[PDB]
Design a protein around this motif. Structure first.
Motif, PDB file in Angstrom:
ATOM      1  N   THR A 169      -6.317  -5.994   0.305  1.00  0.00           N
ATOM      2  CA  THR A 169      -5.779  -5.305   1.367  1.00  0.00           C
ATOM      3  C   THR A 169      -6.105  -3.633   0.875  1.00  0.00           C
ATOM      4  O   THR A 169      -5.944  -3.146   0.037  1.00  0.00           O
ATOM      5  CB  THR A 169      -4.171  -5.293   1.311  1.00  0.00           C
ATOM      6  N   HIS A 171      -5.311  -0.131   1.753  1.00  0.00           N
ATOM      7  CA  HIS A 171      -4.156   0.609   1.896  1.00  0.00           C
ATOM      8  C   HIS A 171      -4.145   1.885   2.792  1.00  0.00           C
ATOM      9  O   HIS A 171      -3.250   2.331   3.404  1.00  0.00           O
ATOM     10  CB  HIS A 171      -3.412   0.772   0.422  1.00  0.00           C
ATOM     11  N   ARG A 172      -5.227   2.748   2.539  1.00  0.00           N
ATOM     12  CA  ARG A 172      -5.607   3.841   3.249  1.00  0.00           C
ATOM     13  C   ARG A 172      -7.047   3.934   3.861  1.00  0.00           C
ATOM     14  O   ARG A 172      -7.807   3.350   3.218  1.00  0.00           O
ATOM     15  CB  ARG A 172      -5.121   4.937   2.619  1.00  0.00           C
ATOM     16  N   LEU A 191      -1.788   1.404   9.676  1.00  0.00           N
ATOM     17  CA  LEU A 191      -2.945   1.966   9.057  1.00  0.00           C
ATOM     18  C   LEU A 191      -3.900   3.007   9.790  1.00  0.00           C
ATOM     19  O   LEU A 191      -4.620   2.332  10.235  1.00  0.00           O
ATOM     20  CB  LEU A 191      -3.813   0.875   8.110  1.00  0.00           C
ATOM     21  N   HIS A 242      -7.781   0.766  -1.704  1.00  0.00           N
ATOM     22  CA  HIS A 242      -6.894  -0.334  -2.413  1.00  0.00           C
ATOM     23  C   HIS A 242      -6.010  -0.013  -3.564  1.00  0.00           C
ATOM     24  O   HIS A 242      -6.882   0.129  -4.655  1.00  0.00           O
ATOM     25  CB  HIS A 242      -7.718  -1.798  -2.160  1.00  0.00           C
ATOM     26  N   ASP A 243      -4.703   0.181  -3.482  1.00  0.00           N
ATOM     27  CA  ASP A 243      -4.176   0.435  -4.844  1.00  0.00           C
ATOM     28  C   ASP A 243      -3.651  -0.819  -5.433  1.00  0.00           C
ATOM     29  O   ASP A 243      -2.824  -1.664  -4.780  1.00  0.00           O
ATOM     30  CB  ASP A 243      -2.709   1.366  -4.411  1.00  0.00           C
ATOM     31  N   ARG A 246       0.405  -1.110  -6.063  1.00  0.00           N
ATOM     32  CA  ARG A 246       0.974  -1.334  -4.605  1.00  0.00           C
ATOM     33  C   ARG A 246       0.993  -2.707  -4.340  1.00  0.00           C
ATOM     34  O   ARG A 246       1.941  -3.287  -3.780  1.00  0.00           O
ATOM     35  CB  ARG A 246       0.683  -0.372  -3.485  1.00  0.00           C
ATOM     36  N   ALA A 247      -0.178  -3.323  -4.416  1.00  0.00           N
ATOM     37  CA  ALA A 247      -0.629  -4.656  -4.047  1.00  0.00           C
ATOM     38  C   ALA A 247       0.413  -5.724  -4.839  1.00  0.00           C
ATOM     39  O   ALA A 247       1.039  -6.703  -4.291  1.00  0.00           O
ATOM     40  CB  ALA A 247      -1.965  -5.150  -4.338  1.00  0.00           C
ATOM     41  N   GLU A 277      -7.259   1.835  -8.576  1.00  0.00           N
ATOM     42  CA  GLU A 277      -7.851   1.553  -7.137  1.00  0.00           C
ATOM     43  C   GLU A 277      -9.061   0.840  -7.081  1.00  0.00           C
ATOM     44  O   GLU A 277      -9.878   0.720  -8.107  1.00  0.00           O
ATOM     45  CB  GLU A 277      -7.938   2.910  -6.195  1.00  0.00           C
TER      46      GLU A 277
END
Ligand SMILES: Nc1nc(N)c2ncn([C@@H]3O[C@H](COP(=O)(O)OP(=O)(O)OP(=O)(O)O)[C@@H](O)[C@H]3O)c2n1
Ligand SMILES: Nc1nc(N)c2ncn([C@@H]3O[C@H](COP(=O)(O)OP(=O)(O)O)[C@@H](O)[C@H]3O)c2n1
Lengths: 305, 312
Positions: A169, A171-172, A191, A242-243, A246-247, A277
């Motif tokens: 995913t 993320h930003r 997003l 992608h972090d 966080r995932a 990341e």
């Protein structure tokens, strides 16, 4: 059994048509080389069924594929097998005009007639460049171009390879190209596509280390010098973060794990980085036709690491 | 695995392309519990305009139309013919001979008129009902597909059906039986001539098939011709082909210089082995032909009486 059941009927035709054209192509030998006529060529089929096979397709529709030999060769040069391409378009309807294949590997964008004209004007030089860099490029990777006619209305679409991971995913996201920034409107979606200025005021950086950075900069320079040598501009660099951590919030895909043959724009973070990341970066929007732009673009992107 | 569709003429290249395309398309279409009436009025049509593309063997421009495809697919099934077999016999290699046969000698393709196509349409429902009621066991033509080709703006209608003759056993002599008709001195001097009734009578050939084979043959011939009469159909013939087992043995051996009389009833469906007490060991192929059209009831009766008198 492929039913070509889709979210919209134009998608059923897209699936039928890619299935049809890829099967047809599998009966056409692979040439020793492409010829100039292969860059002016096209495939066209017109379908008028009656009380037959109407469960998921229209009874009447048209499908046109542009430069089928060229785009087949491009697919090969991007390491994409033709049956894999076919399966991602026909095993299951694309999703969310802007679409992705069910498996999130390929992107399908509706485009203008003019954009098609522009793809033609650049296709020979673009193919030659793809071969010169052995498929290793940050440019868009065009895998096929099609014209669909359903209810007398034509719809043009270009399939290309995804910038983001088909499993990780993002993320930003940022879109870098004066001064441009994201609206209170844009900034309020799930997003947002944040433009350059908001990325500058945010102060995120991407630490990929010297070894990775040097070769990346080489490839970005090659691409923009090519696009300048064709007097193309207003193209952007799209970048997604992608972090892994966080995932986080029976075979298990690991954290921040990906296949570089499949997610071809992805880069793992350097050891000396704040968070762990993964980054995806590539050039986009290259069909809207200066050289000076090349210079400002490359200098801009240069200062991130 | 590559299919090139190379043929002596562009129409056959289109024929192969089209049977390939329609059988593939059909492979994505579920098989229904039963046919619906719309399947008897239905059709598939494709129009191809390539440009500087795929021109080695196909025209750049052509059209292909298939009639009642669900129906002929069901007929294919009810005749015991797999769809993959069908497409392969038509497309692995160009058919040869308009009237032609697939390379593997399994299936036959005849050009027909527009009217023939209309007539096939008007009779198709009752013909399908007849095929299903007799579990596919009939001396009638066994229609497996009907197509319309357009190449150079010209329409050509074609009907694919099962071969009367064996795909492996050589047919040594043949007749067309139904007044008085005979084969021309032109015909009679040809390679394998189509001998009519009179030459069969003046020659005095007979077919020794033994009682059980004869009885089953006459039963199904009666059912079939009563069907054609109940359809007010006439001018149809009985086609008869003879294979001499001993001669086939010798000619295989003679090509060798430079089992015998065995066949598969699942495949050679009009064939009959000779009776055990028969002069020579022979194989016979017999079927009704030419049914896409003086009284039809009298026609049925006289036909059945005549054909009754050519067996033992
Ligand atoms: N009893 C019956 N039922 C049908 N369901 C049926 N269907 C077709 N036939 C007949 O054969 C022709 C086929 O080509 P068609 O003429 O249909 O082909 P089409 O009409 O698309 O275009 P054309 O005008 O360029 O030929 C028809 O004109 C008719 O003569 C049919 N007959
Ligand atoms: N081996 C074989 N298997 C079949 N299923 C088959 N069906 C029809 N024939 C031929 O059709 C023509 C009769 O049909 P017709 O068009 O009235 O005469 P021609 O114009 O062609 O002279 C004759 O040449 C038959 O021998 C067949 N031959």
């Amino acid at each position: 059994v492929k039913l070509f059941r889709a979210s919209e009927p134009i998608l059923s035709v897209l699936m039928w048509g890619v299935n049809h054209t890829i099967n047809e192509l599998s009966n056409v030998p692979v040439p020793v080389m492409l010829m100039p006529d292969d860059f002016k060529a096209y495939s066209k089929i017109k379908v008028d069924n009656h009380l037959f096979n109407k469960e998921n397709l229209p009874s009447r529709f048209k499908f046109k594929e542009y430069c089928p030999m060229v785009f087949r060769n491009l697919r090969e040069r991007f390491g994409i097998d033709d049956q894999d391409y076919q399966n991602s378009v026909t095993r299951s309807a694309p999703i969310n005009r802007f679409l992705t294949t069910y498996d999130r590997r390929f992107v399908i964008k509706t485009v203008s007639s003019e954009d098609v004209a522009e793809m033609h004007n650049i296709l020979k030089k673009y193919h030659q460049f793809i071969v010169e860099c052995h498929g290793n490029t940050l440019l868009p990777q065009f895998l096929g171009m099609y014209r669909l006619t359903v209810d007398g209305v034509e719809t043009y679409m270009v399939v290309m390879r995804n910038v983001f991971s088909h499993r990780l995913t993002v993320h930003r996201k940022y879109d870098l190209k004066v001064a441009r920034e994201a609206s209170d409107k844009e900034k309020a979606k799930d997003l947002p596509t944040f433009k350059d200025n908001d990325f500058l005021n945010e102060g995120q950086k991407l630490h990929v280390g010297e070894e990775s950075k040097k070769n990346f900069l080489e490839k970005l320079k090659r691409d923009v010098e090519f696009l300048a040598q064709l007097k193309i501009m207003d193209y952007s660099l799209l970048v997604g973060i992608h972090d892994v951590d966080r995932a986080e919030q029976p075979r298990f895909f690991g954290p921040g794990e990906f296949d570089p043959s499949v997610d071809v724009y992805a880069m793992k973070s350097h050891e000396s980085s704040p968070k762990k990341e993964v980054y995806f970066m590539a050039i986009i929007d290259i069909l809207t036709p200066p050289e000076q732009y090349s210079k400002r673009f490359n200098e801009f992107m240069s200062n991130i690491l």
